[PDB]
Design a binder for this molecule. Structure first.
Ligand SMILES: [Mg+2]
Length: 528
């Protein structure tokens, strides 16, 4: 019987397994998936019910582990509909919340130059994307630096963790795929949240369902090299073996990939080489090159049409940022944040636009984890300039302990709090801390690095017989690479191609950017 081998266990390969089982009528036994106090916020943070067509469809076949008779899609949408989002303190500067006045976050704050360039970028056809090769956002708006002082830039860069040195291609894809969210970017009312963090709300329901269908899960094997069959013209990609190392025993070997078996590789991950600290210990930067990209980099030693992984994993300056998760033993700290920001938990992130490190925090709906106790509260924060000094803790953010990161956050919170109450309650706040876990990710935004078309392999390269790339570093049209939808889409493309399902059966994506009314509203929104 035909077999499938997944290298990486993220949502992309899991969705491939789902597609194989549901639409290809495979047996789970034929699929092998190979991966490797206080909470840590792992996983994707957003979704969008108007987009993510593939994700909702895959997740409509995974049962909820919490609610009998509900699919994971049902869980997620039922929750979100009952917890609508309206960000209030989206932007916070040294004077207060940009809720009102001249800097009101309803104002994009665009030039006429800013709208001209932004409209040119937005209206460039998909077929012309290569014209943007290696052009950063900084470069495309080189003539109008005023852009990088607007509300829109502050909101857009922090919403997705984009840098100005990053690829202008995605900003274009945003303005087309996410066009509907343009008019509501400041309230983030279009964001769709799952009840808990997505590892618990999405990943484990998926693994459980797959495990129940027979899929084999392996986590001791480091796949070390592809083994390709040679051909006279050397175009075809035919994987014949997977060289492995067992990281616990030390055994090495080769798994034979027979004729009719398929291989799914996740060529790179935004969490590769990440490291962790705790309340009193700063991170130690893992200097190793992205381990999940090594199979990819090695295949380029044999084939010429597979891209340049160094574009994505060779420039940490483009890709790195740092986050942290706070756990408290009482609701007090969350109550204080909720009061100072004029916002109930679960209403999207709050960005301190005048902070030196560009710090944002997110307070989720509580609880965010299944093992969260009734008395416990959790929130999450990150900065986009981890090398810069903190405003209140005057050392580089990336060198801070988890405590120091909270202290730097409180400083900004206290600065916005006129009552002075939070600062007064400092000792009690800190005593309530279970942990504050810093989390450094050198490739966190590597999927946004400056890129040229062709720097990423096709999901199924033009002459690949049985190798597919399912990742945020494979080439797919239209979709935003930030979204979990991207990897789910790669999976359907790969599975349907390998199985012979024609592309008109692929899941149909919404094209709001060709509805004239949508464009009209988008055009008007430019002047808001
Ligand atoms: Mg919605």
């Amino acid at each position: 019987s035909h077999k499938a081998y997944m290298i990486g266990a993220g949502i992309g390969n899991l969705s491939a397994a789902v597609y194989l089982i549901r639409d290809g009528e495979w047996n789970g036994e034929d699929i092998t998936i190979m991966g490797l106090a206080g909470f840590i916020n792992r996983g994707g943070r957003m979704l969008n019910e108007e987009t993510y067509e593939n994700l909702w469809d895959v997740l409509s076949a995974v049962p909820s582990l919490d609610n009998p008779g509900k699919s994971v899609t049902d869980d997620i949408l039922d929750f979100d509909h009952a917890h609508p989002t309206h960000d209030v303190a989206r932007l916070i500067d040294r004077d207060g919340i940009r809720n009102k006045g001249e800097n009101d976050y309803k104002h994009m704050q665009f030039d006429n130059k800013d709208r001209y360039l932004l409209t040119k970028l937005m209206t460039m056809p998909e077929s012309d994307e290569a014209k943007l090769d290696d052009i950063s956002i900084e470069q495309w708006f080189e003539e109008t630096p005023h852009f990088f002082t607007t509300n829109f830039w502050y909101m857009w860069e922090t919403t997705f963790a984009f840098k100005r040195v990053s690829s202008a291609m995605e900003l274009r894809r945003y303005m087309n795929r996410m066009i509907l969210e343009f008019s509501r970017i400041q309230t983030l009312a279009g964001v769709t949240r799952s009840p808990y963090n997505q590892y618990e709300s999405i990943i484990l329901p998926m693994r459980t369902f797959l495990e129940g269908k027979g899929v084999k899960f392996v986590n001791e094997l480091k796949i070390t090299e592809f083994v390709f069959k040679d051909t006279p013209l050397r175009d075809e990609i035919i994987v014949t073996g997977l060289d492995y190392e067992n990281v616990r025993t030390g055994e090495k070997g080769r798994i034979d990939v027979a004729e009719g078996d398929f291989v799914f590789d996740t060529n790179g991950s935004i969490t590769d080489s990440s490291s962790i600290g705790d309340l009193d210990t700063p991170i130690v930067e893992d200097m190793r090159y992205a381990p999940s990209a090594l199979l990819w980099k090695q295949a380029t030693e044999h084939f010429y049409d597979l891209g340049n992984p160094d574009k994505f994993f060779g420039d940490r300056a483009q890709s790195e940022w740092t986050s942290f998760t706070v756990t408290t033993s009482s609701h007090e700290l969350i109550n204080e944040i909720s009061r100072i920001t004029k916002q109930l938990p679960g209403n999207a992130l709050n960005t301190f636009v005048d902070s030196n490190v560009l710090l944002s925090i997110v307070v989720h709906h509580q609880p965010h984890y299944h093992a969260q106790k009734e008395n416990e509260g959790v929130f999450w924060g990150y900065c986009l300039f981890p090398r810069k000094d903190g405003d209140y803790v005057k050392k580089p953010f990336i060198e801070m302990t988890g405590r120091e990161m909270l202290e730097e956050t409180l400083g900004h919170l206290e600065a916005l709090d006129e009552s002075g109450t939070l600062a007064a309650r400092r000792q009690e706040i800190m005593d309530s801390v279970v942990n504050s876990i810093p989390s450094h990710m050198p490739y966190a935004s590597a999927l946004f690095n400056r890129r040229a078309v062709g720097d990423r392999p096709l999901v199924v390269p033009k002459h690949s017989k049985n190798l597919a790339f399912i990742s945020q570093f494979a080439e797919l049209p239209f979709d935003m690479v930030f979204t979990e939808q991207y990897s789910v889409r790669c999976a359907q493309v790969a599975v349907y191609k390998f199985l012979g399902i024609p592309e008109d059966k692929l899941t149909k994506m919404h094209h709001y950017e060709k509805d004239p009314k949508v464009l009209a509203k988008a055009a008007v929104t430019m002047f808001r």
